[PDB]
Amino acid sequence: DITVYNGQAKEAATAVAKAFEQETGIKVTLNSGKSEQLAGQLKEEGDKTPADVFYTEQTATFADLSEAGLLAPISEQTIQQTAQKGVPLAPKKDWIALSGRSRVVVYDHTKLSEKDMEKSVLDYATPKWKGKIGYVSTSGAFLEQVVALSKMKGDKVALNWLKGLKENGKLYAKNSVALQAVENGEVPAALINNYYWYNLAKEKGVENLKSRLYFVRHQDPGALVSYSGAAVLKASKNQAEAQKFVDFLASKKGQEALVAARAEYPLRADVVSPFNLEPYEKLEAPVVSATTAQDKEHAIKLIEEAGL
Ligand SMILES: [Fe+3]
Ligand SMILES: [Fe+3]
Ligand SMILES: [Fe+3]
């Protein structure tokens, strides 16, 4: 049996854990928390950690652990299972990207069509969208978007975008609130994440929704995908079962368990989500370096500088 430090949504972690125990007979104990806190605990605990695997919603959090020599190598064959073009790879082969969530524009299709949408996420923060674009400045994925903009286009462009949203956008407290605002006709469009829309669509049925999704694609900063993944702890004295779990998460069956439980994009090419997601490859996500704590501190300063 193994212990998994879990930073991923509980529905996902519980679903893949269950499917692992059913397929192998090996029991999984999840110890759940914030990935940043969990990684900190794994560094503090060092070679005394009871964690066998670290399952996360953000592969960027592996960087420090890899740098500290705390992660074990994974099989190159396992890594290749999810190694589609654009998917982050561990240079030391000591973690694996498993799935993704995407930035998206949700819009009221009875007020706008795709003809009204922008080819760049930058263009939603302009006077054409005054009073007509929702955004969630407090959300984690919004912060990831800002980091991506700074990296891809520099600070002036990112800051200008944030100023644009301050002047032209409508602020919402949460992604779910922004989605309901579009559904209820308060705002014709909003910047959110994909899984919110697909959850609403799976629950209520798409024929009963006013809102649809527009994907900017072509490696625009607005096509940003955030990657979930797993790693085995070097300190684990149960390498065989830890590696079996990670191998399982990258297998067809493990990916199937994940996508049934949550509307993330599988990174296997041969699995299809029952949420009716398009293939990962079609998203055309940009290639962006992992978010560091420094990246985040700096994006927070841009948000403040912009009046948000
Ligand atoms: Fe969240
Ligand atoms: Fe989220
Ligand atoms: Fe959320």
From Swiss-Prot:
Lineage: Bacteria, Pseudomonadati, Pseudomonadota, Gammaproteobacteria, Pasteurellales
Any Pfam family: SBP_bac_1
Parts forming coiled coils: none
Gene from which the chain derives: fbpA
Location(s) in or outside the cell: Periplasm
Source superkingdom: Bacteria
CDD domains named among the record's database cross-references: PBP2_Fbp (cd13543)
Name of the protein: Iron-utilization periplasmic protein
Induction remarks: By iron deprivation.
Gene3D superfamilies on file: Periplasmic binding protein-like II
Organism per entry: Haemophilus influenzae (strain ATCC 51907 / DSM 11121 / KW20 / Rd)
GO BP of this protein: iron ion transport; transmembrane transport
Biological role stated in the UniProt entry: Part of the ABC transporter complex FbpABC (TC 3.A.1.10.1) involved in Fe(3+) ions import. This protein specifically binds Fe(3+) and is involved in its transmembrane transport.
Transmembrane segments: none
